Design a protein around this ligand. Structure first.
Ligand SMILES: OC[C@H]1O[C@@H](O)[C@H](O)[C@@H](O)[C@@H]1O
Ligand SMILES: OC[C@H]1O[C@@H](O)[C@H](O)[C@@H](O)[C@@H]1O
Ligand SMILES: OC[C@H]1O[C@@H](O)[C@H](O)[C@@H](O)[C@@H]1O
Ligand SMILES: OC[C@H]1O[C@@H](O)[C@H](O)[C@@H](O)[C@@H]1O
Lengths: 448, 447, 448, 447
């Protein structure tokens, strides 16, 4: 059984700005919604903030050396909007942009392909005071922001992500309020989802106008499996699936919004002008999939708003985030996604990984995380299985390069293949990282 | 004796979303409360303002009720989104026509219309543009004000701009118990500033295109000492600054309270010099909303004022949990008279109490002796305040009707007229009958 | 007319721990409520019965208030631990002397003393031996009963054994909202059984050494249909069985309700037959405590009866959240008459309502029109019940005094006499003033 | 070097309700955990001990597992309700026959049986008589003890009376998180006293009819300073007194800690002198159950010790939220040696850690590196304690099997042998393998 991956298959690791950078108000950088959110009592586990995080803003060179040691061929990262344009619109912050300039040059020097994401949940607070994702004008704002980077890194950054996980942004930020900006409203949720899609489309158009290379959106998908043969449970499954997995993909593929949403959001649902949908379906060059687990939803009449709830799959191992470990569902998702996009759209797993308990410090220079290693090997094999079934998969990015701030869950959830001691900023490569380095090095042959 | 000054104006007060119903009828736009009340968990028993008192349909009956109560003034608010569905742009003819009919009808009955521009029901379309976090609202509001100023020129002579900035910001942006349901000190500071600016802009617009008298309406809750411990006094001043001085001081041209720098910490901001010039734009009158006092003590974990009220078990409490203590009204009025230098005519735009009443009348009656008591003792307290030199021009009872007490739903009844929400049947309570006699005798019944 | 039958006895009721105070005074022992009320979280506002109405010291004043109210009867309870500090053994002379003086004072006033042996205040020493879970309590109780039976032989002629077995067991052992604060269906079943046995043993002992009439006091909350749906009728029957028939049926020699097997499942037990012979020991009268009705519907997650009341929003509710609905009193009396075969003399030993009153009088008055309304409508309902052939001999208002409403503390005022708990000053409410007229006119005032 | 003293006994520990299952099978009576676990809300995920590890049926397999681990001792508890169904009266032949078979099987395997009389599973019939609140239990327990003492005379030579009085009382009577689920300080004080008395009575009875060595087993959680704040030191001493000195002190003839008067307030009681004579009956050995330390700070609303632990984020924490800090073991042992005058032979009857393991093996393996780390560091800490003169005779790993962690259910795995609760399949973890090597080399594997 060979597990050699196709020629040119790109191996890498991923991060996000607010989760690792720190130095949030340094060198002209503006205030973001997460600056506000994390400094409001009760919002974050243990009162954790992104003020320091992995201190990546200061230690990025060391982190690049770590990327070299892991044999990374790509590094997926996001750019902080508020660091580059403090008020979201208007004046550019020279120092802030200069950081990412140095970073990208350093990556290219090391032979690492820089994969940049425009928006990873950190909207400028100044734009939030103008309504944030509820204001349609954001489609323009985002575009302008996108342009600034497109021209600045022309020929250096060739592969672009627009939005990272619209569902997390809207469902967490506007529907239930567990994430910044912390709103709880179905009305706002539908409007926000629509404007996130529109902003993506606008950014793609602007990219056609001034940019060079390939651009696409990044979706998280959590495949919904049957709980039973009861029709109410199938209705539950379809509601959950529609709200989470089809909400954004369908209009991006020109299929409009899922019918089930009319039922999920009820009186909060809206009909939008057709030209919005033409803008939203603006053709992309590639698509990123963020994948971690599956769910098995059953009917739940009091669960707002999808009226569904996951059934705990006690037959399998679970991560520290409470996610079932089940690799075949990755293969299934990749096939499903290939079908939804017609096989015409190049795909990349832009995020995959797992959180398990690690001690806060290295133990004799080591971190032994056997379950993370297991997750890594089984899911990469599942990737190979997906390619064997004809899915056009071009690459794989491990979430995450570093133990970092897992947003509202703080530092308690470690996703890194590199351990970070948050007291000393000391980095220690985990057994999972060592293994991943070997997987890259053998181009998959180590799995045989 | 308790006879009141000549020309002293007696009335009752309401607000649009709390009584109107028909929130989406006849072109009416969606407001932030339409959204808020239809989100599960926000409202007690899942109550909404969809029907309320059905006043949009029964306003004539309600006016006849005003006549039975001998009212000389009626304080009400205009729903911004009913008049301007998108907050800016096209006027909604029927929505404006409702208030046209209402005001004309009031004038026919000899009742003075006291109009409030904003009573917490922001158009949702403006909320999607940031609401009170967007400085442009100062202009938006002004334009809205103009529409009314010109429409009711010569008919509505007494105007309120904003009703209770503190409730709007503290409830709506700081703690999130009210629409639009945000919870942020940063947003609270910005929103408070833009509320004050909006008031100023509306007053300027009124100077250019309006006719009559214009002013803001503040709620004040006097903070009394819990002890002689210094940390408790510091607590008292934090609470007082955050609730009672936050808006009054910049309105009187004295800037923001120093204590706010301590209350909001990193969320506090410095604002441009000209903003305070706009905010202190001279007004003609001021409204006071008053219900109770508080006795704050130090509470380090209470965010963000680090203070909390001490339950005053020696006195009666309302169904909203507010201490019954009329002397604090007198004091407050005096205090207010002093903060505004005595030059600014004051009016009690809201005062009243919530007690349990049955959901239906009992042989054509509702017996509410505690509400009657609250009424008589606090009106006497008004007389005492006038005796100490306060230029107090009138008194409006909250409320004319049992209505939607926002997030607390219909469970909190403030009306001097009972509303059976099953049948929309109105029954005048004993408090209403008594209030009618207080008006007719111009206070002599209190002797 | 609303004139009541000849000899119809009007009175008012209290309980020891709710009014007395002086819980550890003059040799008095520790009760389960002494412990319970001084455990944080158990009582609203941290209220205790340490002082209450200070009745232990102000009983003479309270008797003068009874005369002013024209009371013909005063129903009160005797604190077991005040009379027998350890529950068994040595008698406390001063403690017993209190009730001696009280009873003599009542007789001096021309007031019928109505004594209750047990009103929820078990001696802590007996609770340490298992309390109502220990079958030997049937004997302990009997012995305690004997002490009183002999002491007031010829003075107290009408005796209550247990006040509301359902509240004792459901509140004290099933859900833990009342002392001793256990939460167990197993314990609930056993405790209910032993409470019934204790009642029987006490009645037998009364036959051996006592004089007059003896009976139990049950509270009943009639369960009305929420719908004609069979699941709701089954729910109604479960609730009715657990609350209204659990104790009445074995007392009438009918055994335990079948539905209990379904309600309690694995916690249900079969008991020896002679136990049921003991439980059905013939009594002379029965007390009904009545306040409201319920309208139960099916509720699969409601433990353990799988039912829940539907809020009857068309009617007024008290501050304890109880629907005001007088016809249900009439129905209940009829029902009870039918269950007891018409052969057992009935008395309403508790009826009343809680509404907000200020903490102090207002120029010498307390105006409680809703309590007055409750009083007049429910007394009229009694007349209706007598008109339907129910053998009703009397009516006791709960309560004579504002007192400690157990776990709900002093916030719930049931008194027709207001108590300022800051000053212990008594002020007769409008309800008391009206009730005095009801007694005086023997019901004729309800006409005019 | 880490070679241990000659005769140092290596073993592993379990408890009856946590592993046996078949709780009311073969004549066995109902225990308080039978009731408690089958009452909704009491147990995580609704887990019960109905099946557990099915040890009642699979004990032979488990003994083969003990042999593969090179165990020299197996510490287990006897279910009171399995042996005497009503707690008093008739013996249950089958229930006793199980432990007879078990003990013979262990002796046959060359494994020293260490028996515990009470590990939290009081017979329900005795709970209906007041349980640990009824002083008569001192006698009941004694009788129960006698039954075992005589049945296993010459076979079971090392006896434990009570396992962790503090958990029994604090969990079962003070806070109500454990069976019998009471929450009362009054009851907590009484129950603690009667547990101590029961221990004494059992020791006396053992002197009359038993053979071998008898002792109690205490859990100790050493309390370290959170700060130099005096309120925090007072907090530390309250917590220390309530948890670590409550039982040890009267066992050593020093009476109850003074601080308890402050902790329990009005619930505290004075007891007869002869009670303390009974409680201090001389024992032959003492068991220490040890897992972690705590760092308490002042907490006025924390009932009743008014203290709370400060999270030590510089160190690793187990899945039960317990800090991993091996030196505190060494210190504790020394402290215990000092409190007992160095004259009383000590044994660590429980030490171990809970980390996440998958519910099934991979592949026929369970890799638990943190449990291995915990094991090596704490065993080294034992060696350090022995080097300082502590008379430590043995070490028992908690636990032999993944089992029911009481109210936290099966989610907390303490086993050095993994149990697949779907299939009852046992798989020796890396920790078990390593421990087997530690026993074999008598410590030399550590170096
Ligand atoms: O929750 C784990 C991860 O989920 C990903 O899909 C998000 O992009 C990350 O920001 C987050 O850390
Ligand atoms: O809480 C009672 C009343 O308080 C007033 O100050 C507000 O303006 C009303 O909207 C509210 O119903
Ligand atoms: O719930 C109010 C009243 O209910 C009666 O059934 C109880 O016997 C009283 O003790 C209690 O005060
Ligand atoms: O909490 C983990 C362990 O703690 C020990 O002290 C108890 O004796 C065990 O029964 C329990 O499983």
């Amino acid at each position: 059984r060979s597990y050699r991956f196709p020629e040119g298959f790109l191996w890498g690791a991923a991060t996000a700005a607010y989760q690792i950078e720190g130095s949030s108000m340094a060198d002209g950088a503006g205030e973001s919604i997460w600056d506000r959110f994390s400094h409001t009592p009760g919002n974050m586990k243990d009162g954790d903030t992104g003020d320091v995080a992995c201190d990546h803003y200061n230690r990025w060179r060391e982190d690049i050396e770590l990327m070299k040691r892991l044999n990374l061929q790509a590094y997926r990262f996001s750019v902080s909007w508020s660091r580059v344009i403090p008020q979201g619109r208007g004046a550019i912050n020279p120092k802030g942009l200069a950081f990412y300039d140095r970073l990208v040059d350093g990556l290219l020097e090391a032979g690492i392909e820089p994969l940049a994401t425009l928006y990873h949940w950190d909207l400028p607070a100044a734009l939030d005071d103008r309504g944030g994702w509820l204001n349609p004008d954001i489609a323009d704002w985002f575009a302008d922001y996108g342009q600034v980077l497109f021209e600045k890194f022309k020929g250096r950054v060739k592969t672009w992500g627009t939005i990272n996980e619209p569902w997390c942004i809207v469902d967490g930020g506007y529907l239930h309020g567990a994430l910044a900006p912390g709103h709880r409203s179905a009305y706002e949720a539908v409007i926000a989802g629509h404007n996130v899609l529109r902003a993506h489309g606008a950014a793609v158009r602007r990219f056609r106008e001034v940019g060079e290379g390939q651009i696409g959106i990044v979706l998280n998908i959590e495949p919904k499996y049957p709980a039973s043969d009861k029709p109410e449970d199938e209705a539950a499954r379809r509601r959950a699936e529609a709200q989470m997995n089809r909400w954004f993909l369908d209009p991006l593929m020109g299929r409009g919004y899922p019918e089930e949403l009319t039922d999920v959001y009820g009186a909060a649902w809206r009909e939008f002008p057709k030209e919005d949908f033409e803008l939203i379906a603006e053709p992309t060059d590639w698509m990123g999939l963020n994948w971690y687990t599956r769910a098995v939803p059953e009917n739940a009449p009091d669960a707002w708003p999808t009226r569904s709830r996951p059934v705990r799959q006690t037959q399998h191992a679970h991560t520290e985030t409470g996610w079932e470990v089940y690799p075949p569902a990755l293969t299934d998702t990749l096939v499903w996604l290939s079908e939804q996009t017609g096989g015409k759209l190049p795909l990349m797993v832009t995020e995959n990984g797992s959180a398990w308990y690690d001690p806060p410090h290295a133990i004799d220079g080591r971190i032994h995380d056997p379950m993370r290693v297991h997750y890594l090997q089984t899911h990469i094999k599942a990737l190979h299985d997906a390619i064997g079934k004809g899915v056009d998969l071009r690459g794989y990015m491990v979430w995450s390069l570093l133990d970092n701030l897992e947003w509202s869950l703080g530092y308690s959830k470690r996703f890194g293949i590199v351990h970070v001691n948050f007291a000393t900023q000391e980095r220690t490569i985990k057994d999972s990282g060592l293994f991943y380095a070997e997987v890259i090095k053998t181009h998959g042959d180590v799995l045989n």
